[PDB]
Coordinates of C-alpha atoms in Angstrom, one line a residue:
Chain P
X1 CA 132.0 83.7 146.6
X2 CA 133.4 83.1 142.6
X3 CA 136.9 83.7 140.7
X4 CA 138.9 86.1 139.4
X5 CA 138.9 85.1 135.9
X6 CA 134.6 85.9 136.3
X7 CA 135.4 89.4 137.6
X8 CA 137.6 90.3 135.3
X9 CA 134.9 89.6 132.2
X10 CA 131.8 91.3 133.9
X11 CA 134.7 94.0 134.7
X12 CA 136.4 95.6 131.9
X13 CA 135.6 94.1 127.9
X14 CA 138.9 94.4 126.9
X15 CA 140.5 91.3 127.2
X16 CA 144.4 92.1 127.2
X17 CA 144.1 94.0 130.7
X18 CA 142.1 91.4 131.6
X19 CA 144.9 89.1 130.0
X20 CA 147.5 91.7 132.5
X21 CA 145.1 91.4 135.5
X22 CA 145.5 87.3 135.5
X23 CA 149.3 88.0 134.6
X24 CA 149.9 89.8 137.5
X25 CA 147.6 87.4 140.4
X26 CA 150.3 84.9 138.8
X27 CA 153.4 87.2 140.0
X28 CA 151.8 87.7 143.2
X29 CA 151.0 83.6 143.5
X30 CA 154.7 82.9 143.5
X31 CA 155.9 86.3 145.0
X32 CA 154.8 84.8 147.6
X33 CA 155.7 81.3 147.3
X34 CA 159.3 82.9 147.5
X35 CA 158.8 85.5 150.8
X36 CA 157.1 82.3 152.6
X37 CA 160.4 80.0 151.2
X38 CA 163.0 82.5 151.3
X39 CA 166.2 81.9 153.4
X40 CA 167.5 84.5 155.3
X41 CA 170.1 83.3 157.0
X42 CA 173.3 85.6 155.8
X43 CA 172.5 90.2 155.8
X44 CA 169.9 88.8 152.7
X45 CA 166.5 87.4 152.2
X46 CA 167.5 85.0 149.3
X47 CA 165.6 82.9 146.6
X48 CA 166.1 81.1 143.2
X49 CA 165.3 83.1 140.0
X50 CA 165.2 80.0 137.2
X51 CA 168.8 79.0 138.2
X52 CA 170.6 82.5 139.8
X53 CA 169.7 82.9 143.6
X54 CA 168.3 86.8 144.3
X55 CA 167.3 88.3 146.8
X56 CA 163.7 88.6 147.7
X57 CA 163.4 91.8 146.6
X58 CA 164.7 91.0 143.0
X59 CA 162.8 87.4 142.3
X60 CA 159.7 89.7 142.5
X61 CA 161.5 92.4 140.0
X62 CA 162.0 89.5 137.5
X63 CA 159.3 87.7 138.1
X64 CA 157.2 91.0 137.6
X65 CA 159.6 92.1 133.9
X66 CA 158.3 88.2 132.7
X67 CA 154.8 88.3 133.4
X68 CA 154.6 92.0 131.8
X69 CA 157.2 90.0 128.7
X70 CA 154.8 87.5 128.2
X71 CA 151.8 89.1 128.8
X72 CA 152.1 90.8 124.9
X73 CA 150.1 93.3 126.4
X74 CA 152.2 95.7 128.0
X75 CA 153.9 98.4 125.7
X76 CA 156.3 99.9 128.7
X77 CA 157.3 98.4 131.9
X78 CA 158.6 100.5 135.5
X79 CA 159.7 99.3 138.4
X80 CA 161.4 101.1 141.9
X81 CA 164.7 99.8 141.6
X82 CA 166.2 101.4 138.3
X83 CA 163.3 104.1 137.7
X84 CA 164.3 104.6 133.9
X85 CA 161.5 103.0 131.4
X86 CA 162.2 99.2 129.6
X87 CA 160.4 98.6 126.5
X88 CA 158.1 94.9 127.0
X89 CA 158.2 95.2 123.1
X90 CA 154.2 94.6 123.3
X91 CA 151.8 97.4 123.1
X92 CA 147.9 98.4 124.8
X93 CA 149.8 99.7 128.2
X94 CA 152.1 100.3 130.2
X95 CA 153.0 99.0 134.3
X96 CA 154.7 100.9 136.7
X97 CA 155.2 98.2 140.0
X98 CA 157.2 98.5 143.4
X99 CA 158.2 94.8 143.3
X100 CA 158.7 94.1 147.1
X101 CA 158.1 97.2 149.0
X102 CA 159.2 96.9 153.0
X103 CA 162.0 93.9 151.2
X104 CA 164.1 95.0 154.1
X105 CA 161.8 93.4 157.0
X106 CA 161.0 89.9 155.7
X107 CA 163.6 88.2 158.4
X108 CA 161.7 89.8 160.6
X109 CA 158.5 88.9 159.4
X110 CA 155.9 92.1 158.9
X111 CA 152.7 91.6 156.4
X112 CA 155.4 93.0 153.3
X113 CA 153.3 92.8 149.2
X114 CA 154.1 94.3 145.8
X115 CA 152.4 97.9 144.4
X116 CA 151.3 97.5 140.8
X117 CA 149.7 101.0 137.8
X118 CA 148.4 100.2 135.1
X119 CA 148.0 102.8 132.6
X120 CA 147.5 103.1 128.5
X121 CA 149.6 103.8 125.4
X122 CA 152.9 104.2 126.1
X123 CA 154.5 106.9 128.1
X124 CA 155.3 106.4 131.5
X125 CA 156.1 110.6 132.1
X126 CA 153.6 113.0 131.5
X127 CA 150.4 110.9 133.0
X128 CA 148.4 111.1 135.7
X129 CA 147.2 108.9 137.8
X130 CA 143.5 109.9 137.5
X131 CA 144.7 108.1 133.6
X132 CA 145.1 104.8 135.7
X133 CA 142.5 101.8 134.0
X134 CA 143.0 100.1 137.4
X135 CA 145.7 99.5 139.7
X136 CA 146.6 96.4 142.1
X137 CA 148.9 95.3 145.1
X138 CA 149.0 91.6 146.4
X139 CA 149.4 91.3 150.2
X140 CA 151.7 89.5 151.9
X141 CA 150.9 88.0 155.1
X142 CA 149.5 84.7 156.9
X143 CA 147.4 85.2 154.1
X144 CA 147.4 86.1 150.3
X145 CA 145.8 89.0 148.7
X146 CA 144.9 90.3 145.7
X147 CA 143.5 93.6 146.0
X148 CA 142.3 95.5 142.4
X149 CA 140.1 97.5 141.6
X150 CA 139.6 98.1 137.4
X151 CA 138.6 102.5 136.4
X152 CA 135.0 101.8 134.5
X153 CA 134.0 99.5 137.2
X154 CA 133.0 101.0 141.4
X155 CA 134.1 99.2 144.8
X156 CA 137.8 97.9 145.7
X157 CA 138.4 93.5 145.9
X158 CA 140.1 91.5 147.5
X159 CA 141.2 88.3 146.2
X160 CA 142.1 85.3 149.1
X161 CA 144.4 82.8 147.3
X162 CA 142.7 79.3 147.7
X163 CA 144.3 75.9 149.0
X164 CA 143.3 74.5 145.4
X165 CA 145.9 77.9 144.0
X166 CA 143.2 79.8 142.7
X167 CA 142.1 83.1 143.5
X168 CA 138.4 84.0 145.2
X169 CA 136.7 86.9 145.2
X170 CA 136.0 87.3 149.0
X171 CA 134.8 91.1 150.1
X172 CA 134.0 94.0 147.9
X173 CA 134.7 97.7 149.7
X174 CA 132.4 101.1 148.7
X175 CA 132.4 103.1 151.5
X176 CA 135.2 103.7 154.0
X177 CA 133.8 105.8 157.6
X178 CA 134.8 107.1 160.2
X179 CA 137.0 106.2 162.8
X180 CA 140.2 105.9 165.4
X181 CA 143.3 104.7 164.1
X182 CA 146.2 106.6 162.4
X183 CA 149.4 105.5 160.6
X184 CA 151.6 108.7 161.3
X185 CA 154.5 107.8 158.4
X186 CA 157.2 110.2 158.7
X187 CA 156.8 111.1 162.6
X188 CA 160.2 112.8 162.5
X189 CA 158.3 116.0 160.5
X190 CA 156.3 116.8 164.1
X191 CA 159.9 118.3 164.7
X192 CA 159.6 121.5 162.7
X193 CA 156.0 120.9 160.5
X194 CA 153.9 122.3 163.6
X195 CA 150.4 122.2 161.1
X196 CA 152.0 118.6 161.2
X197 CA 152.3 118.5 165.3
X198 CA 149.2 119.7 166.3
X199 CA 147.3 116.8 163.4
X200 CA 149.1 114.1 165.8
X201 CA 148.8 115.6 168.6
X202 CA 144.4 115.3 167.4
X203 CA 144.7 112.0 167.0
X204 CA 146.6 111.3 170.3
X205 CA 144.5 112.7 172.6
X206 CA 141.2 112.2 169.9
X207 CA 142.6 108.2 171.5
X208 CA 143.2 107.5 167.9
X209 CA 144.5 103.2 167.7
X210 CA 148.7 103.8 166.3
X211 CA 149.3 101.5 163.8
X212 CA 152.4 101.8 161.5
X213 CA 154.8 98.8 160.2
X214 CA 156.9 101.2 158.1
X215 CA 155.9 99.0 154.7
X216 CA 152.9 101.2 152.5
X217 CA 151.3 98.6 151.3
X218 CA 149.8 96.8 154.2
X219 CA 149.8 99.8 156.9
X220 CA 146.8 101.7 153.5
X221 CA 145.3 98.0 153.1
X222 CA 143.9 98.3 156.5
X223 CA 141.7 101.6 155.5
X224 CA 140.5 98.9 152.8
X225 CA 139.7 96.9 155.4
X226 CA 138.4 98.2 158.1
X227 CA 136.6 100.6 156.3
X228 CA 138.2 103.5 158.9
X229 CA 142.1 105.4 159.8
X230 CA 144.5 107.4 158.3
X231 CA 147.3 107.5 156.4
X232 CA 149.8 110.7 156.7
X233 CA 153.4 110.6 155.1
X234 CA 154.0 114.8 155.2
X235 CA 157.2 116.1 154.3
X236 CA 159.8 119.1 156.5
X237 CA 162.2 121.3 156.0
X238 CA 164.7 119.1 157.5
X239 CA 162.4 116.6 156.4
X240 CA 161.7 115.2 152.7
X241 CA 160.0 113.5 150.9
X242 CA 160.4 109.4 149.9
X243 CA 157.3 108.3 148.4
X244 CA 157.0 108.1 144.5
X245 CA 154.1 108.6 142.4
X246 CA 154.6 106.1 140.2
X247 CA 155.3 102.7 141.7
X248 CA 153.2 103.4 145.7
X249 CA 151.2 106.4 145.4
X250 CA 149.4 107.2 142.7
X251 CA 148.6 102.8 141.9
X252 CA 146.9 103.0 146.1
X253 CA 145.6 106.6 145.3
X254 CA 143.5 104.5 143.3
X255 CA 142.2 101.8 145.4
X256 CA 142.0 103.6 148.1
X257 CA 139.2 106.3 146.5
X258 CA 137.5 103.1 144.9
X259 CA 136.1 101.8 148.3
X260 CA 135.6 105.1 149.2
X261 CA 138.8 107.1 150.2
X262 CA 139.7 109.9 149.4
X263 CA 143.7 111.6 148.7
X264 CA 145.6 115.1 149.4
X265 CA 148.5 114.7 147.8
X266 CA 151.5 117.5 147.3
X267 CA 150.8 119.9 148.9
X268 CA 148.3 120.7 147.0
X269 CA 144.9 119.4 149.0
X270 CA 143.8 117.4 145.8
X271 CA 143.8 113.5 144.9
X272 CA 146.4 112.0 143.8
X273 CA 145.1 111.4 141.1
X274 CA 145.4 114.6 139.9
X275 CA 149.0 115.8 140.1
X276 CA 151.4 115.8 137.2
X277 CA 153.8 112.6 136.7
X278 CA 157.0 114.4 135.1
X279 CA 159.6 111.7 135.7
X280 CA 159.3 108.3 137.0
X281 CA 161.7 108.5 140.4
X282 CA 159.4 111.4 141.2
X283 CA 159.0 111.9 144.7
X284 CA 155.5 113.1 147.1
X285 CA 153.9 113.4 150.4
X286 CA 150.4 111.6 151.1
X287 CA 147.5 111.3 153.5
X288 CA 144.8 108.2 152.5
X289 CA 142.1 108.1 154.6
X290 CA 138.3 108.5 154.9
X291 CA 136.4 111.8 153.5
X292 CA 136.1 113.0 157.0
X293 CA 139.4 112.3 157.8
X294 CA 140.9 114.4 154.6
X295 CA 138.8 116.8 154.7
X296 CA 140.6 117.6 158.4
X297 CA 144.2 117.1 157.6
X298 CA 143.4 119.3 155.0
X299 CA 142.2 122.0 156.8
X300 CA 145.0 121.3 159.6
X301 CA 147.9 121.5 157.0
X302 CA 146.6 124.0 154.5
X303 CA 143.8 125.8 156.6
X304 CA 140.9 124.3 154.3
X305 CA 139.9 121.6 151.8
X306 CA 138.6 123.2 148.9
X307 CA 136.6 119.9 148.7
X308 CA 135.2 119.2 150.9
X309 CA 135.1 122.3 154.1
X310 CA 131.4 123.3 154.0
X311 CA 131.0 126.2 151.9
Chain H
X1 CA 170.1 73.5 159.6
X2 CA 168.4 70.5 161.6
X3 CA 164.4 69.5 163.2
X4 CA 163.6 70.6 165.6
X5 CA 163.2 67.2 167.6
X6 CA 166.8 67.4 167.6
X7 CA 167.8 70.2 169.1
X8 CA 165.5 69.8 172.2
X9 CA 167.3 66.0 172.9
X10 CA 170.4 68.6 173.0
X11 CA 171.0 70.9 176.2
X12 CA 167.6 70.1 177.8
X13 CA 167.8 67.0 178.8
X14 CA 164.2 66.5 180.4
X15 CA 161.8 64.2 177.5
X16 CA 159.1 65.9 179.4
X17 CA 160.1 69.2 178.2
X18 CA 160.6 68.2 174.8
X19 CA 156.9 67.2 174.9
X20 CA 155.8 69.5 175.7
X21 CA 157.8 72.0 173.0
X22 CA 157.6 69.4 170.4
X23 CA 153.0 69.2 171.5
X24 CA 153.3 73.8 171.3
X25 CA 154.6 73.4 168.0
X26 CA 152.4 71.1 166.4
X27 CA 149.8 73.2 167.4
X28 CA 151.6 76.6 165.9
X29 CA 151.3 74.7 162.8
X30 CA 148.2 73.9 162.8
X31 CA 146.9 77.4 164.3
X32 CA 149.2 78.8 161.6
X33 CA 146.9 77.3 158.9
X34 CA 143.5 78.2 160.4
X35 CA 144.7 82.2 160.2
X36 CA 145.5 80.9 156.6
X37 CA 142.2 80.0 155.4
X38 CA 140.3 82.2 158.2
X39 CA 136.9 83.2 156.4
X40 CA 137.0 87.0 157.4
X41 CA 133.1 87.5 155.7
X42 CA 132.1 89.8 157.8
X43 CA 131.9 91.0 161.7
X44 CA 134.7 88.6 162.7
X45 CA 137.3 86.3 161.6
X46 CA 136.2 82.4 161.4
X47 CA 137.3 78.5 160.9
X48 CA 136.7 75.5 162.4
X49 CA 137.5 73.4 165.2
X50 CA 136.3 70.1 164.7
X51 CA 131.7 70.0 164.7
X52 CA 131.9 73.8 165.1
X53 CA 132.9 76.7 163.7
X54 CA 134.5 79.9 166.1
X55 CA 136.7 82.8 165.4
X56 CA 140.2 81.6 164.6
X57 CA 141.2 82.9 168.4
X58 CA 139.3 80.4 170.2
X59 CA 139.7 77.9 167.9
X60 CA 143.7 78.5 168.9
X61 CA 142.3 79.3 172.2
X62 CA 141.1 75.4 172.3
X63 CA 144.1 73.5 170.5
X64 CA 146.4 74.8 172.2
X65 CA 143.6 73.5 175.5
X66 CA 143.5 70.6 173.3
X67 CA 147.6 69.5 172.9
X68 CA 148.6 70.6 176.7
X69 CA 145.8 67.4 176.9
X70 CA 147.3 65.0 175.1
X71 CA 150.9 65.9 176.6
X72 CA 149.8 65.0 179.4
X73 CA 152.9 66.5 181.3
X74 CA 150.6 69.7 181.6
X75 CA 149.3 69.9 185.7
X76 CA 147.5 73.2 184.7
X77 CA 147.1 75.5 182.0
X78 CA 145.5 78.9 181.3
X79 CA 144.8 81.7 179.3
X80 CA 144.2 85.4 178.2
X81 CA 140.6 84.4 177.9
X82 CA 139.3 83.5 180.8
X83 CA 142.1 83.9 182.9
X84 CA 141.0 81.2 185.5
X85 CA 143.2 78.1 185.6
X86 CA 142.1 74.6 185.1
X87 CA 143.7 71.6 185.6
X88 CA 143.5 68.9 181.8
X89 CA 144.7 65.6 184.1
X90 CA 148.6 66.1 184.1
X91 CA 151.8 66.5 185.5
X92 CA 155.1 68.2 185.1
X93 CA 154.5 72.3 184.0
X94 CA 152.0 75.7 183.7
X95 CA 151.3 76.4 181.6
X96 CA 149.9 80.3 181.0
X97 CA 149.3 81.3 176.7
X98 CA 147.4 84.4 174.6
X99 CA 146.8 82.3 172.4
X100 CA 146.1 85.1 169.3
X101 CA 147.0 87.7 170.0
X102 CA 146.3 90.8 167.7
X103 CA 143.3 88.3 166.0
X104 CA 141.8 92.0 166.1
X105 CA 143.6 92.5 163.2
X106 CA 143.9 89.4 161.1
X107 CA 141.1 90.7 158.6
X108 CA 144.3 93.3 157.4
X109 CA 146.7 90.4 156.6
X110 CA 149.6 92.2 158.9
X111 CA 151.1 89.7 160.8
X112 CA 149.5 88.1 163.8
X113 CA 150.8 85.8 166.7
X114 CA 150.5 83.6 169.8
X115 CA 152.8 83.7 173.8
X116 CA 153.2 81.0 175.9
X117 CA 154.8 81.2 178.9
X118 CA 156.3 77.7 181.3
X119 CA 156.6 76.8 184.5
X120 CA 156.8 73.6 187.3
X121 CA 155.3 72.3 189.7
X122 CA 151.4 73.4 190.2
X123 CA 150.9 76.7 190.6
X124 CA 150.5 79.8 188.2
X125 CA 150.2 82.5 190.9
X126 CA 152.9 83.1 194.0
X127 CA 155.6 82.5 190.7
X128 CA 158.5 84.4 188.5
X129 CA 159.3 84.8 185.4
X130 CA 162.8 84.0 185.5
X131 CA 161.2 80.6 187.5
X132 CA 160.4 79.7 184.0
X133 CA 161.5 76.6 182.4
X134 CA 161.1 77.2 179.0
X135 CA 158.6 80.0 176.4
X136 CA 157.7 80.6 173.5
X137 CA 155.9 82.3 170.3
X138 CA 154.8 81.8 167.0
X139 CA 154.7 84.4 164.5
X140 CA 152.2 83.7 161.9
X141 CA 152.8 85.1 157.8
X142 CA 154.5 85.2 155.3
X143 CA 156.4 82.9 157.0
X144 CA 155.2 80.8 160.2
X145 CA 158.4 80.4 162.7
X146 CA 158.8 79.3 165.7
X147 CA 160.8 81.0 168.2
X148 CA 161.7 79.0 171.1
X149 CA 164.4 79.2 175.0
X150 CA 165.2 77.7 176.7
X151 CA 166.0 77.1 180.9
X152 CA 169.0 75.1 180.8
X153 CA 170.2 76.8 177.1
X154 CA 171.6 79.5 175.6
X155 CA 170.1 82.2 173.0
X156 CA 166.9 82.9 171.6
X157 CA 166.6 80.3 168.2
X158 CA 164.3 80.7 165.0
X159 CA 162.9 77.4 163.7
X160 CA 161.4 78.1 159.4
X161 CA 157.7 75.7 158.8
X162 CA 159.3 74.0 155.9
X163 CA 157.4 73.3 153.3
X164 CA 157.9 69.2 154.4
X165 CA 155.5 70.3 156.8
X166 CA 158.6 70.2 159.5
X167 CA 160.3 72.9 162.2
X168 CA 163.7 73.6 161.2
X169 CA 166.6 75.7 163.3
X170 CA 167.3 78.8 161.3
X171 CA 168.5 81.2 163.0
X172 CA 170.4 81.3 167.2
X173 CA 169.9 84.7 168.7
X174 CA 172.7 85.6 171.0
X175 CA 172.9 89.4 172.4
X176 CA 171.3 92.3 171.6
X177 CA 172.8 95.5 170.3
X178 CA 171.7 99.4 170.5
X179 CA 169.0 100.0 168.1
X180 CA 167.6 102.6 165.1
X181 CA 163.9 101.5 165.2
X182 CA 161.5 101.6 168.0
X183 CA 157.9 100.4 169.2
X184 CA 156.0 103.1 171.1
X185 CA 153.0 101.4 172.2
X186 CA 150.4 103.8 174.4
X187 CA 151.7 106.6 172.9
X188 CA 148.9 108.8 174.3
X189 CA 151.0 108.1 177.8
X190 CA 153.2 111.1 176.3
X191 CA 150.5 113.6 177.1
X192 CA 150.7 112.7 181.2
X193 CA 154.3 111.9 180.9
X194 CA 156.9 115.0 180.0
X195 CA 159.4 111.5 181.2
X196 CA 157.8 109.3 178.0
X197 CA 157.9 112.5 175.7
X198 CA 161.2 113.6 175.7
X199 CA 162.5 109.3 175.6
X200 CA 159.7 109.1 172.6
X201 CA 161.5 112.8 171.0
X202 CA 165.2 111.1 171.7
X203 CA 164.3 108.1 169.6
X204 CA 162.6 110.5 166.7
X205 CA 165.5 112.6 166.4
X206 CA 168.0 110.7 166.4
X207 CA 166.3 108.9 163.7
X208 CA 165.0 105.6 165.0
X209 CA 162.7 104.1 162.6
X210 CA 158.6 104.2 163.7
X211 CA 158.0 100.1 163.6
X212 CA 155.0 99.6 165.2
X213 CA 151.5 97.2 164.8
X214 CA 149.1 96.3 166.4
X215 CA 150.6 92.3 168.1
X216 CA 152.8 91.8 170.9
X217 CA 154.2 89.2 169.0
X218 CA 155.9 90.8 165.8
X219 CA 156.3 94.3 167.8
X220 CA 159.0 92.2 169.4
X221 CA 160.8 89.4 167.5
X222 CA 161.4 92.5 165.5
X223 CA 163.9 92.7 167.2
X224 CA 165.2 89.2 167.9
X225 CA 165.4 88.9 164.3
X226 CA 168.0 92.2 163.6
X227 CA 169.6 92.4 167.3
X228 CA 168.2 95.7 167.7
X229 CA 164.7 98.0 168.8
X230 CA 163.4 99.1 171.7
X231 CA 159.4 97.8 172.4
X232 CA 158.1 100.9 175.4
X233 CA 155.2 100.5 176.7
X234 CA 154.5 102.9 180.0
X235 CA 151.2 103.4 181.6
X236 CA 149.3 106.3 181.4
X237 CA 147.7 108.0 185.8
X238 CA 144.3 107.3 184.5
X239 CA 144.1 104.6 182.0
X240 CA 145.5 101.5 183.3
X241 CA 148.0 99.5 181.7
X242 CA 146.8 96.7 179.4
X243 CA 149.9 94.1 179.3
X244 CA 149.5 90.8 181.4
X245 CA 153.6 89.0 183.0
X246 CA 151.3 86.0 183.3
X247 CA 150.5 85.7 179.1
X248 CA 152.7 88.0 176.8
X249 CA 156.0 90.1 178.5
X250 CA 156.9 87.4 181.7
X251 CA 157.3 84.9 178.6
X252 CA 158.9 87.5 176.2
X253 CA 160.8 89.1 178.6
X254 CA 162.3 85.3 178.8
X255 CA 163.0 85.2 175.1
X256 CA 164.2 89.0 174.5
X257 CA 166.9 88.7 177.7
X258 CA 168.1 85.1 176.5
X259 CA 168.8 87.0 173.1
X260 CA 171.3 89.0 174.8
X261 CA 169.0 91.7 175.9
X262 CA 167.5 93.7 179.2
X263 CA 163.7 94.3 180.4
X264 CA 162.3 97.2 182.3
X265 CA 158.9 96.0 184.0
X266 CA 156.7 97.3 186.5
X267 CA 157.7 101.5 188.0
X268 CA 160.2 99.2 189.4
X269 CA 163.3 99.1 187.1
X270 CA 164.1 95.4 187.1
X271 CA 163.4 92.7 185.6
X272 CA 159.8 91.0 184.0
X273 CA 161.5 87.9 185.7
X274 CA 162.1 89.1 189.2
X275 CA 158.5 90.2 189.3
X276 CA 156.0 89.1 191.8
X277 CA 152.7 87.3 189.3
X278 CA 150.2 86.8 192.6
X279 CA 147.3 87.1 190.0
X280 CA 146.7 84.9 186.5
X281 CA 145.1 88.1 185.2
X282 CA 148.1 90.6 187.2
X283 CA 148.7 93.5 184.1
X284 CA 151.9 95.5 184.0
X285 CA 154.7 97.8 181.9
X286 CA 157.1 97.3 180.1
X287 CA 160.8 98.1 178.2
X288 CA 162.3 95.5 175.7
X289 CA 166.1 96.0 174.3
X290 CA 169.3 96.0 174.4
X291 CA 171.3 97.0 177.6
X292 CA 171.8 99.9 175.7
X293 CA 168.3 101.1 175.4
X294 CA 166.9 99.4 178.6
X295 CA 170.0 101.5 180.6
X296 CA 168.2 104.8 178.6
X297 CA 164.0 104.1 179.1
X298 CA 165.6 103.1 182.8
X299 CA 167.3 106.8 182.7
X300 CA 164.7 109.0 181.5
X301 CA 161.7 107.3 183.1
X302 CA 163.6 107.9 187.2
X303 CA 166.2 109.5 186.5
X304 CA 169.8 107.1 186.5
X305 CA 169.9 102.8 186.1
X306 CA 169.8 100.9 189.0
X307 CA 171.3 97.5 187.5
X308 CA 173.4 100.2 185.3
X309 CA 174.2 103.4 186.4

């Protein structure tokens, strides 16, 4: 119905945060075009960043660092690739991002995406996901979608990229309900984690539909769209954790809890927004989904849900 | 790095088949735009077909029937919905298509696709997949891809939709080599089929990566791209199969085997190209992948592989 800038002026009174969001949305539009026209002739999928030709996941990386530099509102930036923060010479926010999640399957024409979370202040460590003032993800499929949520504004919001190159609000999400769909990341952990094995058997026995592309952005965005489903990624003795709180799990946690979902993070049966992030490359495990399905996750994995079990 | 028309006039002498392939390619380009701009405001994902506004899978259905009629070379056509053939006054080939496989998840911005298979003559029943003269699938977003294989030409071929709106050959695929990802369709079947449970546990133990969207088009196209991977769909004794030989698995079988792979269809340990098609709406189970992985599928399911020892 209405544009992204019109949405931003009502959602937050901070013009710096509105500038930052417009920058990320522009970087997402450019990355989307970089992926659409990428040459995957060799072992890598490449495209151009100025005068040099790089892999699309490096094109996206340098595009996002550029957008952050010329936003003037970014103090620190950090990418999954080099998980060491770097000073952008602005001040106002610190942003951590996964520039092209699932870039290894761009050649398969699967959906891929960008993740970013926005913190205030100057630190990107000794913070928690809840301190995020905003988070967003770009989704690159047959349609280009900018999906954001801000700390002091309700709902998770979808902006569709239109033919005139402008972002238009298309859907607000406020509640995630019950349904039969599961995305079991780290399915191998059922070998030696019996609790996770019993939970996956529940999903199968109850005839939940399987949907797991491996790329996190569409595997989680499908919950916001359908207002149903569960995403699980679980550690085991022979299977160690590969998801990062800073670049992936915490930003998506805000996007999920806004729009009415919940999250269970680490092995701790708390929200990802409450997990302390001590190093930028910190790893973790996560479950997203409706409050009901997160309650079941914690009950199967840990015995009870301290937040959602009947008292 | 050459155009689709330049590809067609080489390694297929029939100009009628070249005309039909050009028509299909134009349909998938239109459908790719109808998906990109579709309005998913609510229960359905809609877009326009002329004066009326329909669901995108129905828009694609009318677009394909329209492209075949104006092709003048299509004697019979048949869609996944309304699985009864219709004539639309042509002569040359009979076509069967799934117009938008995975249309239920278009709103989730996953990759969706179209499938079509091309036969000669006038019948679309009492045929087999091997009689196909060509088959193809269109793969939608973030890139638009037209994937083809023809009977009188080697390999499976990929055409990318370029900025100028024209199709360009980007990859020929011959040979598929073992696997490191599996697409376990009908994963519930492991509950009462202990053979399928062992095979899936093999895939997991050997550290294959799970890669399964809802739709068949990207789930199988990832094998042609990576030259690796397995797709498995096994029937449970109680719940029937869902895949159709005419619209889905026999066209995909041509593409996979032309790409150097193999297929094990029905419960019969044979190629999907050799299964008799008695009714258009006929169901089936299938497993795609490399020769080594189809070997292992048949060896786990049935004991040994009659075709590959």
